[PDB]
Amino acid sequence: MVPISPIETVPVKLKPGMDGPKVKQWPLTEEKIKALVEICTEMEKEGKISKIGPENPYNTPVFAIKKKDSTKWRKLVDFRELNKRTQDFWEVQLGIPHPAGLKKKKSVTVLDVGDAYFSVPLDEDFRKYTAFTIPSINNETPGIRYQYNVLPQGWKGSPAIFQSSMTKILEPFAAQNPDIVIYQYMDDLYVGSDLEIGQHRTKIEELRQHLLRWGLTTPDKKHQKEPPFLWMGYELHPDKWTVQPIVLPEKDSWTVNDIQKLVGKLNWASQIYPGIKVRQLSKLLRGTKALTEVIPLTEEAELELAENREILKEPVHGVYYDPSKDLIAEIQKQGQGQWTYQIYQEPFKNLKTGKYARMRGAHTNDVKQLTEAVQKITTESIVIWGKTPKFKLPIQKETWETWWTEYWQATWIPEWEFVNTPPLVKLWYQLEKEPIVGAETFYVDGAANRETKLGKAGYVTNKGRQKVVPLTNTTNQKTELQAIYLALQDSGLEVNIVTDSQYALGIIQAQPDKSESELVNQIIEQLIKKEKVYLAWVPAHKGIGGNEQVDKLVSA
Amino acid sequence: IETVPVKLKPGMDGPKVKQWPLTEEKIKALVEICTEMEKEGKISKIGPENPYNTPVFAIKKKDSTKWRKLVDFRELNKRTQDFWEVQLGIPHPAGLKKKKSVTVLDVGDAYFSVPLDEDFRKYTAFTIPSINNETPGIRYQYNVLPQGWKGSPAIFQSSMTKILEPFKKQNPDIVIYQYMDDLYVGSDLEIGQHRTKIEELRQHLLRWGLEPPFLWMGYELHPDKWTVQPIVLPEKDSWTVNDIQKLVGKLNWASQIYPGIKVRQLSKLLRGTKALTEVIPLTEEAELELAENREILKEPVHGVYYDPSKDLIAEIQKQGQGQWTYQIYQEPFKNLKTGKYARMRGAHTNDVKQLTEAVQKITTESIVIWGKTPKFKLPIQKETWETWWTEYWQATWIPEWEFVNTPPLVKLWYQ
Ligand SMILES: Cc1cc(/C=C/C#N)cc(C)c1Nc1ccnc(Nc2ccc(C#N)cc2)n1
Ligand SMILES: O=C(O)c1cc2cc(F)ccc2[nH]1
Ligand SMILES: O=C(O)c1cc2cc(F)ccc2[nH]1
Ligand SMILES: [Mg+2]
């Protein structure tokens, strides 16, 4: 024989303070017991398991499942209890490769490594914890006791240890053949290259040889699976990729379940199908989670669904990454806090698409949302391609400079250029930095009774203009906002406004253009119509004239 | 040469932190560095039975073109034991902040000469990721004292003092303080003299060493010139209504910090409902009240003390035009130090690079005065900061930070 290199075992431990499993073996029919005996005898012939003496105190239940539409049974060792007691492992399958980051390949061959899996031995000191028992016929003899010598199917550490064992085997072959790509998924190895099919098939045979150094055989009758590959919900072709078919169902009535799976399909399709929107459909699941209840779909939801059906009429494909060309990312505003983007290298051939939704919060504006969408695309691009794309944004360079220089927070967008495709992101108002000469000065204030919810809001001005409005079902914070709204309502196009509300300033200094409070939205609408607005703050209850006068009027 | 026994804290598992995304240039740099470190035995490949992980990335130290590997041991450092076996601690030298030239030296590569306890090495696990996760991440662990781990200076301290024994008693005047991978040396000498005793210092570490890649560097500070911020009120000949409102607002704020601040006569000047731009003459009662407040603001704050058992907190405000203000405190309104920056380096168009450099300079100041880093309250969205701060980081340590989402009105009073 030819000597083969052994696969070094991974030392496995149980979690600290825990012991192995000691679970009862279920009673089995006489027909199931025979089937397990013949199955386990074959596994023992192949070296997968070994019979053990009675001193081993551990046990894991075994079952026999009828392979549907066949007279052949199949074994199942229920390692659920041992998995609870097995240590945590490093899981490399943490992050899938995104197809948009892959490179085009002329040839991609598949090799089966199913036999190589049980050539990976289990740590000798851990094998005792995998003990199981086949019940004897009529319970008149001791049951047959086995333990595993290889990675058992269903055990917690089997995927991680197999992947790491094969990784260590493939490392020298990949390093010394940099003109090929190798990827492992389940019991298969995928080898791609740009080599001519003669040189490519030579590399495949060289890989088969290299695998025999460890005694791992691969089937000679080459794999039936061939491009395209159905993999992780994608369709992989040699020079293109897409998602597996997205079919939106026809339904006269929709359930919470139907909408949950509908948004999931739309989210999955949004990575290559441009312009997918899910806000109005996702609004219908707000707060409630009774799986079977029916929800009437709003007219806003039927339009969004009809728009999505029109986007999904015909297939759309993405191209693969060319490292020799720049990445370009373009963003568009869709409305209602929805943003869509495309990432490409050559015009009209996207690598991938995507979308971004506004975070739920009290107040926000378009510039903040565009900034957040840029940071999400940036991070996603570092993951997939290892570099930041050049951005094409629907915001003028002058608008951005005005925003970030005056915004109270530090903010930054990477290298970008303006693209003139409406709707453009703009600033709807900008407060003055100094008081306005000639503009009327409005001293506003509001107050409310915490028990009766009754309050007043109003203002007094330097020209003698006054107003106090009685209010019901309001709070101290609402009256302070209402008072500012009244000053904006009753003033000319330039106005100075003096308030003592730290609450109202914390809102307005955040510069929102849309809010969850309609009262703030009315103030924003008033601010947009003005020419000049100066907002000044003073502390309350300090004898500040103007503020002191209106406070007595509104707190009465 | 013999490992010191090291344990975590009771009822505490190792770190399991996710490796954040890295650019192509940083991955290739880390692969080249770790390949060399593996050849020199500093690190070793690990298997899947090690579930722990600590993030890693690469930087460029100030004034150099070579990549430096930096491990973010923040989570591990929280979880390792506190070492008071030989010394309860290093009583922080209060004289370092009073020398007029302090140079920072990167001596972290000297840690690699001491092996790490075999049972603790698994907790230093880190991963070199691959682009698009196309190839399995490269998994390493440390065989020697790692840079950035709080146990490295504690374990190596026994060796460091003996290396510096010939230099320190030759130059008794000179203050030497170690924080993590950094060595701060303060002197009262002239700078031309200063840099050559800096390299005189470098003599000892390469002499024993037999090469450290970043030992030839020097970060020159001047803690004697470090400027304070006292509260100052405007001096005007004509005061508008808006001017007096802003003044009363600032004085009301200072009254939380200083007891005897009064605003009653100044507020009376606002009696009526006047235009914001109208000039108001100061009454006498108001001028005296203003002068009395000026006198109060020239004294220090009462009951201000540093407590080494409490965390230092650093707040930062963006003032515009590349200027930033900051305050270090442990209790509200009890500022231990305040300052202001404007000379922010090569980022007149990048807010985040300015803030990242402000954080590093404030942390450097905090290390010199108190010997520990503060927890920052950053005026930036979390997603914006975490995307970009690693691109402008040049220090070997990393402080803690939280994010401010509400605009502080105290910014009006620190400009
Ligand atoms: C991640 C991955 C999944 C499969 C697929 C697993 C399955 N099922 C096959 C391979 C070879 C890879 N690895 C890599 C690495 C770099 N570029 C590429 N490009 C690439 C991959 C497939 C096709 C095709 N057809 C074309 C180009 N693949
Ligand atoms: O470059 C590759 O395709 C590659 C590198 C590599 C290293 C391993 F350890 C296993 C598979 C691999 N594939
Ligand atoms: O760039 C803009 O959109 C913008 C700038 C600006 C300045 C103002 F004074 C008022 C509104 C604005 N909008
Ligand atoms: Mg009031």
UniProtKB/Swiss-Prot annotation, chain A:
Changing E226A: No effect on RNA-dependent DNA polymerase activity. No effect on RNA 5'-end and 3'-end cleavages. Changing W155A: 73% loss of DNA-directed DNA polymerase activity. 70% loss of RNA-directed DNA polymerase activity. Mg(2+) 1 binds at D112, D187, D188. The record marks W403, W416 as: Essential for RT p66/p51 heterodimerization. Changing K67A: Strong decrease in RT binding affinity for all dNTP substrates and in catalytic efficiency. 100-fold decreased sensitivity to ddNTP inhibitors. Changing G233A: Complete loss of RNA-dependent DNA polymerase activity. Complete loss of RNA 5'-end and 3'-end cleavages. Changing D112S: 5- to 12-fold decrease in affinity for dTTP substrates. Strongly decreased RNA-directed DNA polymerase activity. Slightly decreased DNA-directed DNA polymerase activity. No effect on RNase H activity. Changing Y503 to A/G/H/L/S/Q: Complete loss of RNAase H activity. Residues 229-237 are annotated as: RT 'primer grip'. Changing T441S: Almost complete loss of virion production. Changing H541 to D/N: Severely reduces exonuclease activity of RNase H. Probably also reduces substrate binding affinity. Modifies cleavage preferences of RNase H. No effect on the endonuclease activity. Changing L76V: No loss of polymerase activity. No loss of RNase H activity. Changing F442W: Slight delays in replication. Virions contain primarily p51 RT. Multifunctional enzyme that converts the viral RNA genome into dsDNA in the cytoplasm, shortly after virus entry into the cell. This enzyme displays a DNA polymerase activity that can copy either DNA or RNA templates, and a ribonuclease H (RNase H) activity that cleaves the RNA strand of RNA-DNA heteroduplexes in a partially processive 3' to 5' endonucleasic mode. Conversion of viral genomic RNA into dsDNA requires many steps. A tRNA(3)-Lys binds to the primer-binding site (PBS) situated at the 5'-end of the viral RNA. This is Reverse transcriptase/ribonuclease H. It comes from Human immunodeficiency virus type 1 group M subtype B (isolate BH10) (HIV-1). The gene is gag-pol. The chain holds residues 600 to 1153 of 1447 of the full protein.
Curated annotation (Swiss-Prot), chain B:
Mg(2+) 1 binds at D106, D181, D182. Changing W388L: Almost complete loss of RT p66/p51 heterodimerization. Complete loss of polymerase activity. Residues 214-222 are annotated as: RT 'primer grip'. Changing E220A: Complete loss of RNA-dependent DNA polymerase activity. Complete loss of RNA 5'-end and 3'-end cleavages. Changing Y179F: 70% loss of polymerase activity. No loss of polymerase activity. Changing K61E: Strong decrease in RT binding affinity for all dNTP substrates and in catalytic efficiency. 100-fold decreased sensitivity to ddNTP inhibitors. Changing L297S: 31% loss of polymerase activity. No loss of RNase H activity. Changing W149A: 73% loss of DNA-directed DNA polymerase activity. 70% loss of RNA-directed DNA polymerase activity. Changing I163A: 71% loss of DNA-directed DNA polymerase activity. 61% loss of RNA-directed DNA polymerase activity. A motif (Tryptophan repeat motif) lies at residues 385-401. Changing W149F: 10% loss of DNA-directed DNA polymerase activity. 22% loss of RNA-directed DNA polymerase activity. Changing P153G: 34% loss of polymerase activity. No loss of RNase H activity. Changing V185M: 27% increase of DNA-directed DNA polymerase activity. 10% loss of RNA-directed DNA polymerase activity. Changing W401L: Almost complete loss of RT p66/p51 heterodimerization. Residues 40-221 form the Reverse transcriptase domain. Changing D182E: Drastically reduced incorporation of phosphorothioate nucleotide. Loss of pyrophosphorolysis (reverse of the polymerase reaction). No effect on RNase H activity. Changing D182A: Strongly decreased RNA-directed and DNA-directed DNA polymerase activities. Loss of pyrophosphorolysis (reverse of the polymerase reaction). No effect on RNase H activity. The record marks W388, W401 as: Essential for RT p66/p51 heterodimerization. This is p51 RT. It comes from Human immunodeficiency virus type 1 group M subtype B (isolate BH10). The chain holds residues 604 to 1027 of 1447 of the full protein.
